[PDB]
Protein backbone atom coordinates (compact mmCIF):
# COMPACT_ATOMS: atom_id res chain seq x y z
CA UNK A 1 0.00 0.00 0.00
CA UNK A 2 2.89 2.36 -0.93
CA UNK A 3 4.69 3.04 2.37
CA UNK A 4 4.36 6.74 3.06
CA UNK A 5 4.70 9.16 5.99
CA UNK A 6 1.25 9.98 7.34
CA UNK A 7 2.08 13.67 7.64
CA UNK A 8 4.73 16.28 6.87
CA UNK A 9 5.36 19.61 8.59
CA UNK A 10 6.93 22.85 7.46
CA UNK A 11 6.81 26.63 7.68
CA UNK A 12 6.08 28.88 4.67
CA UNK A 13 8.99 29.10 2.26
CA UNK A 14 10.35 25.67 3.22
CA UNK A 15 10.81 23.07 0.47
CA UNK A 16 9.62 19.65 1.60
CA UNK A 17 9.69 16.26 -0.12
CA UNK A 18 7.08 13.52 0.37
CA UNK A 19 8.23 10.05 -0.57
CA UNK A 20 6.52 6.71 -1.19
CA UNK A 21 8.35 3.39 -1.06
CA UNK A 22 7.21 0.08 -2.53
CA UNK A 23 8.52 -3.26 -3.71
CA UNK A 24 11.06 -3.44 -6.54
CA UNK A 25 8.82 -5.52 -8.82
CA UNK A 26 6.08 -2.92 -8.70
CA UNK A 27 7.95 0.35 -8.48
CA UNK A 28 11.29 -0.27 -10.15
CA UNK A 29 10.21 -2.07 -13.32
CA UNK A 30 7.87 0.61 -14.68
CA UNK A 31 8.03 4.40 -14.48
CA UNK A 32 4.33 4.95 -13.69
CA UNK A 33 3.80 7.01 -10.52
CA UNK A 34 1.19 9.75 -9.94
CA UNK A 35 0.44 12.31 -7.22
CA UNK A 36 -3.07 13.54 -6.37
CA UNK A 37 -3.88 16.34 -3.94
CA UNK A 38 -7.27 16.15 -2.22
CA UNK A 39 -8.03 19.43 -0.51
CA UNK A 40 -10.12 18.88 2.69
CA UNK A 41 -13.80 18.42 1.93
CA UNK A 42 -13.25 18.05 -1.83
CA UNK A 43 -12.70 15.42 -4.51
CA UNK A 44 -9.14 14.44 -5.47
CA UNK A 45 -7.25 16.75 -7.81
CA UNK A 46 -4.97 15.89 -10.72
CA UNK A 47 -1.63 17.66 -10.43
CA UNK A 48 1.19 15.28 -11.43
CA UNK A 49 1.23 13.43 -14.77
CA UNK A 50 3.69 10.58 -15.45
CA UNK A 51 6.63 9.73 -13.05
CA UNK A 52 7.90 13.33 -13.36
CA UNK A 53 5.63 15.30 -15.70
CA UNK A 54 2.81 17.79 -15.18
CA UNK A 55 -0.75 18.05 -16.54
CA UNK A 56 -2.04 20.82 -18.78
CA UNK A 57 -2.24 24.21 -17.05
CA UNK A 58 -0.72 23.15 -13.73
CA UNK A 59 1.89 25.08 -11.71
CA UNK A 60 5.57 24.11 -11.92
CA UNK A 61 6.06 24.24 -8.14
CA UNK A 62 5.75 20.45 -7.82
CA UNK A 63 8.00 17.93 -9.55
CA UNK A 64 9.31 14.45 -8.82
CA UNK A 65 11.96 11.76 -9.20
CA UNK A 66 12.22 7.99 -8.81
CA UNK A 67 15.19 6.66 -6.84
CA UNK A 68 15.57 2.90 -6.62
CA UNK A 69 12.31 1.44 -5.35
CA UNK A 70 10.88 4.69 -4.00
CA UNK A 71 9.86 8.05 -5.42
CA UNK A 72 9.25 11.50 -3.99
CA UNK A 73 7.18 14.61 -4.74
CA UNK A 74 9.47 17.64 -5.00
CA UNK A 75 7.59 20.55 -3.40
CA UNK A 76 8.75 24.18 -3.49
CA UNK A 77 8.09 26.77 -0.79
CA UNK A 78 5.00 26.13 1.32
CA UNK A 79 2.17 28.59 1.94
CA UNK A 80 -1.31 28.71 3.42
CA UNK A 81 -2.93 27.09 0.37
CA UNK A 82 -0.91 23.85 0.56
CA UNK A 83 -2.78 22.31 3.52
CA UNK A 84 -4.10 19.15 1.90
CA UNK A 85 -3.87 15.36 1.92
CA UNK A 86 -1.51 14.18 -0.82
CA UNK A 87 -1.91 10.65 -2.18
CA UNK A 88 0.40 8.57 -4.31
CA UNK A 89 -0.42 5.79 -6.76
CA UNK A 90 1.75 3.65 -8.98
CA UNK A 91 1.69 0.57 -11.18
CA UNK A 92 0.69 -2.53 -9.29
CA UNK A 93 1.59 -6.19 -9.74
CA UNK A 94 0.08 -7.35 -13.03
CA UNK A 95 -2.64 -5.08 -14.41
CA UNK A 96 -3.79 -3.11 -11.38
CA UNK A 97 -2.97 0.20 -9.73
CA UNK A 98 -1.67 0.37 -6.16
CA UNK A 99 -2.37 3.44 -4.04
CA UNK A 100 -1.06 4.74 -0.73
CA UNK A 101 -2.74 6.16 2.32
CA UNK A 102 -1.91 9.84 2.47
CA UNK A 103 0.39 12.59 3.67
CA UNK A 104 -1.39 15.29 5.65
CA UNK A 105 0.56 18.48 5.02
CA UNK A 106 0.64 20.74 8.08
CA UNK A 107 1.81 24.27 7.30
CA UNK A 108 3.42 25.88 10.35
CA UNK B 1 5.71 -6.78 -31.36
CA UNK B 2 3.21 -8.89 -29.49
CA UNK B 3 2.17 -6.41 -26.74
CA UNK B 4 -0.04 -8.64 -24.43
CA UNK B 5 1.27 -9.83 -20.97
CA UNK B 6 1.02 -13.70 -21.47
CA UNK B 7 1.41 -16.60 -18.97
CA UNK B 8 2.50 -20.20 -19.34
CA UNK B 9 1.42 -23.50 -17.88
CA UNK B 10 2.34 -27.08 -18.44
CA UNK B 11 0.72 -30.43 -18.21
CA UNK B 12 2.40 -33.73 -17.60
CA UNK B 13 1.00 -36.30 -19.96
CA UNK B 14 1.61 -39.83 -18.82
CA UNK B 15 5.37 -40.40 -17.91
CA UNK B 16 8.29 -38.10 -18.56
CA UNK B 17 7.25 -35.59 -21.11
CA UNK B 18 5.30 -32.45 -20.36
CA UNK B 19 3.30 -30.41 -22.80
CA UNK B 20 3.32 -26.66 -22.90
CA UNK B 21 0.51 -24.28 -23.72
CA UNK B 22 -0.69 -20.78 -23.01
CA UNK B 23 -2.12 -20.43 -19.51
CA UNK B 24 -3.84 -17.08 -19.62
CA UNK B 25 -3.67 -13.57 -20.94
CA UNK B 26 -4.37 -11.29 -17.86
CA UNK B 27 -7.05 -8.95 -19.27
CA UNK B 28 -6.20 -6.75 -22.26
CA UNK B 29 -6.45 -7.43 -26.00
CA UNK B 30 -3.60 -7.94 -28.39
CA UNK B 31 -2.90 -7.12 -32.02
CA UNK B 32 0.23 -8.50 -33.59
CA UNK B 33 1.82 -5.83 -35.70
CA UNK B 34 4.83 -4.42 -37.67
CA UNK B 35 5.46 -0.60 -37.97
CA UNK B 36 7.68 0.54 -40.90
CA UNK B 37 8.58 4.21 -41.74
CA UNK B 38 6.66 5.29 -44.87
CA UNK B 39 9.22 7.84 -45.75
CA UNK B 40 11.86 5.34 -46.30
CA UNK B 41 9.55 2.98 -48.01
CA UNK B 42 8.47 5.39 -50.68
CA UNK B 43 12.01 6.41 -51.27
CA UNK B 44 12.92 2.79 -51.85
CA UNK B 45 10.14 1.89 -54.18
CA UNK B 46 10.87 4.77 -56.49
CA UNK B 47 14.61 4.09 -56.50
CA UNK B 48 13.87 0.52 -57.47
CA UNK B 49 11.48 1.74 -60.16
CA UNK B 50 14.23 3.93 -61.61
CA UNK B 51 16.61 1.08 -61.97
Amino acid at each position, epitope marked *: ALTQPASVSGSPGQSITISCTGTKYDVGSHDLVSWYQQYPGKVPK*YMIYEVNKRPSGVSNRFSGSKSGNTASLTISGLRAEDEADYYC*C*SFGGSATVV*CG*GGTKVTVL | TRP*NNNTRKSVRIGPGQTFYATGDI*I*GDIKQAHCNISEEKWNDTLQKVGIE
Partner: nanobody, 126 residues
Framework: QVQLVQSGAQMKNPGASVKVSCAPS????????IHWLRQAPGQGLQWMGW????????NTARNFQGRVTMTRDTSIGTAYMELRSLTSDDTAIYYC????????????????????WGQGTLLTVS
Protein backbone atom coordinates in the same frame (compact mmCIF):
# COMPACT_ATOMS: atom_id res chain seq x y z
CA GLN C 1 -14.64 20.39 -19.85
CA VAL C 2 -16.35 17.08 -19.06
CA GLN C 3 -18.51 16.36 -16.02
CA LEU C 4 -19.28 12.91 -14.73
CA VAL C 5 -22.74 12.17 -13.29
CA GLN C 6 -23.07 9.67 -10.45
CA SER C 7 -25.96 7.98 -8.62
CA GLY C 8 -27.68 9.14 -5.46
CA ALA C 9 -28.17 7.86 -1.93
CA GLN C 10 -28.31 4.12 -1.22
CA MET C 11 -29.30 2.77 2.22
CA LYS C 12 -29.34 -1.00 2.63
CA ASN C 13 -29.03 -3.86 5.09
CA PRO C 14 -26.34 -6.55 4.83
CA GLY C 15 -26.85 -8.50 1.62
CA ALA C 16 -27.73 -5.48 -0.48
CA SER C 17 -26.60 -6.03 -4.12
CA VAL C 18 -26.32 -2.28 -4.75
CA LYS C 19 -26.21 -0.96 -8.32
CA VAL C 20 -24.05 2.15 -8.80
CA SER C 21 -24.13 4.03 -12.11
CA CYS C 22 -21.80 6.61 -13.63
CA ALA C 23 -22.89 8.46 -16.79
CA PRO C 24 -20.22 10.68 -18.38
CA SER C 25 -21.23 13.93 -20.08
CA UNK C 26 -18.95 15.36 -22.75
CA UNK C 27 -16.65 12.68 -24.12
CA UNK C 28 -17.47 9.61 -26.14
CA UNK C 29 -18.07 6.76 -23.70
CA UNK C 30 -16.28 4.22 -25.90
CA UNK C 31 -13.08 6.27 -26.14
CA UNK C 32 -11.31 6.25 -22.74
CA UNK C 33 -11.06 3.55 -20.05
CA ILE C 34 -13.06 3.46 -16.82
CA HIS C 35 -11.65 2.92 -13.30
CA TRP C 36 -13.63 2.62 -10.06
CA LEU C 37 -12.22 3.48 -6.64
CA ARG C 38 -13.28 3.34 -3.00
CA GLN C 39 -12.20 5.63 -0.15
CA ALA C 40 -13.28 4.47 3.29
CA PRO C 41 -13.48 7.17 6.00
CA GLY C 42 -9.98 7.32 7.47
CA GLN C 43 -8.35 5.19 4.78
CA GLY C 44 -6.80 6.20 1.47
CA LEU C 45 -7.75 5.59 -2.13
CA GLN C 46 -8.39 1.92 -2.81
CA TRP C 47 -8.69 0.97 -6.44
CA MET C 48 -11.53 -1.39 -7.34
CA GLY C 49 -11.35 -2.40 -11.01
CA TRP C 50 -11.09 -1.15 -14.57
CA UNK C 51 -13.46 -1.61 -17.47
CA UNK C 52 -12.84 -1.54 -21.21
CA UNK C 53 -15.99 0.08 -22.63
CA UNK C 54 -15.14 -1.20 -26.11
CA UNK C 55 -15.58 -4.91 -25.42
CA UNK C 56 -16.73 -5.01 -21.79
CA UNK C 57 -13.55 -6.71 -20.51
CA UNK C 58 -12.65 -5.90 -16.90
CA ASN C 59 -10.18 -6.75 -14.13
CA THR C 60 -10.72 -6.11 -10.43
CA ALA C 61 -8.57 -6.15 -7.31
CA ARG C 62 -7.66 -9.35 -5.48
CA ASN C 63 -10.01 -8.95 -2.51
CA PHE C 64 -13.18 -8.58 -4.62
CA GLN C 65 -13.07 -11.87 -6.57
CA GLY C 66 -16.79 -12.52 -6.31
CA ARG C 67 -18.30 -9.48 -4.63
CA VAL C 68 -17.81 -6.76 -7.28
CA THR C 69 -19.02 -7.14 -10.87
CA MET C 70 -18.87 -4.39 -13.49
CA THR C 71 -20.91 -4.13 -16.68
CA ARG C 72 -21.36 -1.61 -19.48
CA ASP C 73 -24.37 -0.23 -21.31
CA THR C 74 -23.24 1.57 -24.46
CA SER C 75 -26.71 2.53 -25.66
CA ILE C 76 -26.91 5.35 -23.13
CA GLY C 77 -23.17 5.60 -22.60
CA THR C 78 -23.07 4.77 -18.88
CA ALA C 79 -21.53 2.03 -16.72
CA TYR C 80 -23.01 -0.11 -13.93
CA MET C 81 -21.50 -1.72 -10.84
CA GLU C 82 -23.13 -4.41 -8.72
CA LEU C 83 -21.87 -4.72 -5.12
CA ARG C 84 -22.77 -8.21 -3.93
CA SER C 85 -22.62 -9.49 -0.31
CA LEU C 86 -22.00 -6.20 1.48
CA THR C 87 -21.65 -5.87 5.25
CA SER C 88 -21.48 -2.86 7.57
CA ASP C 89 -17.68 -2.74 7.20
CA ASP C 90 -18.06 -1.55 3.59
CA THR C 91 -19.34 1.94 4.45
CA ALA C 92 -17.22 4.02 2.10
CA ILE C 93 -17.08 6.85 -0.48
CA TYR C 94 -17.04 5.64 -4.11
CA TYR C 95 -15.37 7.47 -7.00
CA CYS C 96 -15.96 7.31 -10.77
CA UNK C 97 -13.12 8.31 -13.09
CA UNK C 98 -11.91 8.49 -16.69
CA UNK C 99 -8.84 6.37 -17.47
CA UNK C 100 -6.44 6.18 -20.39
CA UNK C 101 -7.15 5.89 -24.07
CA UNK C 102 -8.19 2.60 -25.65
CA UNK C 103 -5.72 1.76 -28.39
CA UNK C 104 -5.35 -1.17 -30.72
CA UNK C 105 -1.60 -1.47 -30.24
CA UNK C 106 -0.51 -1.12 -26.60
CA UNK C 107 -1.91 -1.69 -23.10
CA UNK C 108 -2.75 1.50 -21.27
CA UNK C 109 -5.38 0.20 -18.89
CA UNK C 110 -3.14 0.20 -15.82
CA UNK C 111 -1.88 3.75 -16.23
CA UNK C 112 -2.71 5.57 -13.00
CA UNK C 113 -3.37 8.82 -14.84
CA UNK C 114 -6.82 9.84 -13.61
CA UNK C 115 -7.61 13.15 -15.26
CA UNK C 116 -11.23 13.58 -14.19
CA TRP C 117 -13.12 12.79 -10.99
CA GLY C 118 -16.77 12.40 -10.15
CA GLN C 119 -18.27 14.14 -7.18
CA GLY C 120 -18.45 11.02 -5.02
CA THR C 121 -21.26 8.86 -3.66
CA LEU C 122 -21.66 7.42 -0.17
CA LEU C 123 -23.14 4.00 0.50
CA THR C 124 -24.25 3.11 4.03
CA VAL C 125 -24.87 -0.52 4.95
CA SER C 126 -26.53 -0.94 8.35
Amino acid sequence: QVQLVQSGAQMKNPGASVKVSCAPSGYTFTDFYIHWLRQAPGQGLQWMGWMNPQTGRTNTARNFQGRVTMTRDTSIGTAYMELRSLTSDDTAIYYCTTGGWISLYYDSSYYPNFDHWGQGTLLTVS
